[PDB]
Design a protein around this ligand. Sequence first.
Ligand SMILES: CCOc1cc(N2CCC(O)CC2)ccc1Nc1ncc2c(n1)N(C)c1ccccc1C(=O)N2C
Length: 122
Amino acid sequence: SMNPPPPETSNPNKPKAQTNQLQYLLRVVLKTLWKHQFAWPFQQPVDAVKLNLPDYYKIIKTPMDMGTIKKRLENNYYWNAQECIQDFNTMFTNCYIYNKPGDDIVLMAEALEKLFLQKINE
Ligand SMILES: CCOc1cc(N2CCC(O)CC2)ccc1Nc1ncc2c(n1)N(C)c1ccccc1C(=O)N2C
């Protein structure tokens, strides 16, 4: 019947930071993934209503997507780069937990994860 609210992208109790690694994650790592041909499923929250996934938000306890990560980065939401990296890992992990080995969406996530890891190697 209804999707939960997307994850928060701003929080005035949460100190704003921008570190040099966070600056790289936005301007290089997120930008590279965002423009990839496999990005489209991950550019917004999972729409469990439209995809007809009544159990998604029961199983996936920390939903995450790159639209949220982009906004977090743009809003200086993260305290350091490790917390941003954790969000990306959560995003890939959610897709692997909900879906099945060999599903196209899974194979897309694995390719983006590999790319992500290659880019965070600078
Ligand atoms: C922006 C446009 O988004 C979509 C368009 C279409 N279609 C449908 C069929 C029409 O004919 C044309 C368009 C289908 C899916 C998406 N979006 C989308 N968002 C998130 C997920 C995802 N798909 N996949 C594939 C998953 C499917 C099942 C369970 C989980 C997921 C999943 O883990 N993620 C990340």
